[PDB]
Amino acid sequence: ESILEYFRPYLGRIEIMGASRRIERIYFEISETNRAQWEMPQVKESKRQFIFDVVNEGGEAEKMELFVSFCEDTIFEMQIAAQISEFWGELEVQRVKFLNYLSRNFYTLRFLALFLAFAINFILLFYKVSDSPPNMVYYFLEESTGYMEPALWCLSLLHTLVAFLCIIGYNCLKVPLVIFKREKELARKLEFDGLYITEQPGDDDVKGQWDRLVLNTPSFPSNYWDKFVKRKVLDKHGDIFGRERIAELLGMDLASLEITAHNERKPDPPPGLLTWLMSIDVKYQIWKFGVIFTDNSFLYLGWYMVMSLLGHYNNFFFAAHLLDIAMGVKTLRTILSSVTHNGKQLVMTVGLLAVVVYLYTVVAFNFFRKFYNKSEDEDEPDMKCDDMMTCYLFHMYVGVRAGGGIGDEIEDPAGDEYELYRVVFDITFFFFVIVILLAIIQGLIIDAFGELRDQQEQVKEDMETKCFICGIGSDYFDTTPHGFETHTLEEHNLANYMFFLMYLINKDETEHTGQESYVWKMYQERCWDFFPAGDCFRKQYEDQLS
Amino acid sequence: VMSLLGHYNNFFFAAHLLDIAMGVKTLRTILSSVTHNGKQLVMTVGLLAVVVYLYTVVAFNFFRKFYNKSEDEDEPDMKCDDMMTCYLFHMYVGVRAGGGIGDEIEDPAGDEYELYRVVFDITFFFFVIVILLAIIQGLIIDAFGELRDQQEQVKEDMETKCFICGIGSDYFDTTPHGFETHTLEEHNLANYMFFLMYLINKDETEHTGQESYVWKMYQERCWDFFPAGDCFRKQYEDQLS
Ligand SMILES: Nc1ncnc2c1ncn2[C@@H]1O[C@H](COP(=O)(O)OP(=O)(O)OP(=O)(O)O)[C@@H](O)[C@H]1O
Ligand SMILES: Nc1ncnc2c1ncn2[C@@H]1O[C@H](COP(=O)(O)OP(=O)(O)OP(=O)(O)O)[C@@H](O)[C@H]1O
Ligand SMILES: Cn1c(=O)c2c(ncn2C)n(C)c1=O
Ligand SMILES: [Ca+2]
Ligand SMILES: [Ca+2]
Ligand SMILES: [Zn+2]
Ligand SMILES: [Zn+2]
């Protein structure tokens, strides 16, 4: 009992759909370092997000494929974590320590920048205007103590410094993950689909049209676990393209690859930085700069940097940094996610509002225009519907923002030939423009709240009543006491499958057992059959009570 | 403390009308839906403060000449001459106004910034008033709906699943009144509690084998005697129990 209790965290068990269509239980070793890297909070958040997006998108046939992609991405993620864990050579070692510190404390720098923005705007909250020096107007910071102006300048400089550190930390932390995903997806399209060979990417996929650059670059498979993907694609498409067009397209030399594969020698680089200076791959660096430039988060950080520089230009440009709380706190993320949900609906219904307001505008211009006086000075009439521009502007602004119909502001239609027509006009304007359309906007956002809550509840229910791996309903396991909990914690566990991946990658191919080699060969051939679907060990040997 | 301060001044007794919220259960449910999504409510009024501050800095830098807020021409009452008064004026008047802040601001007609002021007022009315206040209202309405969903779910779970074993209702309802009989006689919460009382009351020497077995797991805190996914009916279904 004591041995099992001690080795229980390191013992991992899974169930695979093995040979002869039989569910087989596989037992293996889980490294303590791998387990700790998995229990790190960032990996937990990534797993939660992956489960949420899988359940929300509803992928069923591709669920195992998305699980494989998540496992590969997160293994590369803790590879990054292990790298960032804890003269010219001294310059390089201090540089890598500095980037290490930034990558470790990226989130703390983000919170520090947000707090600095709060402090800067709190200082700006005492800005005062006086025409006289402290026609043309002076903007001066009024404060009795007088300490907040040097504080403002120092805080501006420190905020820009911390924001630059945020860009550097993002580049050292999240950029490699994005590059790894792009290289992996490009390799999948190149090999398992032939996206550029015996097929052509369409003009719609600008991502493919830009990924065309790294086809011929010698550093194509960098930042990616597979470095022989080019050779594999060459091997499977040489019979179709004569191997010479493949060599030209993917940028190898057949003789060079043969003479390096049979036997290779190792050169020595000089310690000077010049060899790196002309050994940088220009095309691959251009492609990487392009993809990380179109990456959304890096765009947000670049916008933050431009905003900070314009904050140095004028201090009030720092007020735009209070929108950072929306991306920072997750509660604003959910609330503004419900706001942005049905966003096409929102913008196109305010367009419908514009259209119906234009119809009311043309009606009011053709007749009822005498009521649009909008003037108290009798000698100087201020006709607001004397032309379509001013009438449409007046309607779309005043009548829309008014608490009721446009007749609230329009001169009262009493004792007129068009009295009933004006009454009908005002009632229809109030009932459609205000009562219906604004309530449509409000109902859209409220229903977006309800729909997002429904998504969260559905994800929780699916995770509670169905196993992620096999998909067997919970009641069959709950027939046995705590059966579903035991099944989802020991037999089929996402962490256990990931740790099997880590164990297979770590150990040598000569030490693989038959089951491990079988799983490894389907993992190399991208055939997700070993994942049990609709079958577990319990129903495999239910007659024998397992 | 409120009663003692009521002796100090009689008007401190007015705080005791909040006792009805804790007293009657209907106010408990209504104010429970109010307090539900309370972090949401307070942090969205914080978001309202942030966006109002953005509109405040925009209005301070330009459009500030329209914030006269004075009828006496000799004594201007500029409400956006500084960030304090501009932010206060926005966050109070413009938020509480029935529409945009342009309802109270001087009308932007015949000005170089006419279109800019129009866009400013439209955006203020559409985001500050139309969106955010409706977010608050939708939060409380969805809290009502979510609490009603909780009550309906509790009732449904109690109606279709036995509390003890968890077997679905349809298996018992195969027999007429089967679920009612099962939840009233075979597995009953009151019956299990009364077994607890009986075991505690009677002496340990008078315990039968089954009672000693249940008693020893109750002392060792092993809840295995509670049937889970199994009842007498499916235990002897072949023999018709
Ligand atoms: N094959 C499976 N592997 C793992 N979890 C599964 C599987 N099938 C279903 N589940 C469910 O996934 C849920 C995961 O939620 P849980 O909070 O336990 O995860 P966690 O990663 O330990 O959490 P956290 O990140 O909050 O520490 C479990 O409650 C379990 O019922
Ligand atoms: N094992 C169980 N023991 C008791 N009740 C169960 C069990 N399984 C399910 N139930 C359900 O619990 C419900 C309890 O509701 P009910 O109103 O009958 O209870 P009560 O305590 O008698 O009510 P009240 O407090 O209103 O007098 C029953 O309708 C029954 O269907
Ligand atoms: C499939 N696969 C991976 O997914 C992988 C890997 N090395 C790292 N990763 C992530 N190897 C060698 C591998 O064959
Ligand atoms: Ca072997
Ligand atoms: Ca006995
Ligand atoms: Zn399973
Ligand atoms: Zn039961």
UniProtKB/Swiss-Prot annotation, chain B:
ATP binds at M158, E159, T160, K161, C162, F163, T183, L184, E185, E186, H187, N188, L189. Residues 25-39, 145-241 are cytoplasmic. The chain crosses the membrane at residues 8-24, 40-60, 124-144. Detected in skeletal muscle (at protein level). Fast- or slow-twitch skeletal muscle. A motif (Selectivity filter) lies at residues 98-104. The modification Phosphotyrosine is found at Y67. Changing T29I: Decreases threshold for channel activation by K(+), caffeine and 4-chloro-m-cresol. Decreases inhibition by Mg(2+). It comes from the Eukaryota. Ca(2+) binds at T205. The modification Phosphoserine is found at S70. Homotetramer. Can also form heterotetramers with RYR2. Identified in a complex composed of RYR1, PDE4D, PKA, FKBP1A and protein phosphatase 1 (PP1). Repeated very high-level exercise decreases interaction with PDE4D and protein phosphatase 1 (PP1). Interacts with CALM; CALM with bound calcium inhibits the RYR1 channel activity. Interacts with S100A1. Interacts with FKBP1A; this stabilizes the closed conformation of the channel. Interacts with CACNA1S; interaction with CACNA1S is important for activation of the RYR1 channel. Interacts with CACNB1. Binding of [3H]ryanodine indicates that the heterozygous channel is activated by Ca(2+) concentrations 4-fold lower than normal. Single-cell analysis of cotransfected cells shows a significantly increased resting cytoplasmic Ca(2+) level and a significantly reduced luminal Ca(2+) level. Cytosolic calcium-activated calcium channel that mediates the release of Ca(2+) from the sarcoplasmic reticulum into the cytosol and thereby plays a key role in triggering muscle contraction following depolarization of T-tubules. Repeated very high-level exercise increases the open probability of the channel and leads to Ca(2+) leaking into the cytoplasm. Can also mediate the release of Ca(2+) from intracellular stores in neurons, and may thereby promote prolonged Ca(2+) signaling in the brain. Required for normal embryonic development of muscle fibers and skeletal muscle. The calcium release channel activity resides in the C-terminal region while the remaining part of the protein constitutes the 'foot' structure spanning the junctional gap between the sarcoplasmic reticulum (SR) and the T-tubule. Pore opening is mediated via the cytoplasmic calcium-binding domains that mediate a small rotation of the channel-forming transmembrane regions that then leads to channel opening. This is Ryanodine receptor 1. It comes from Oryctolagus cuniculus. The gene is RYR1.
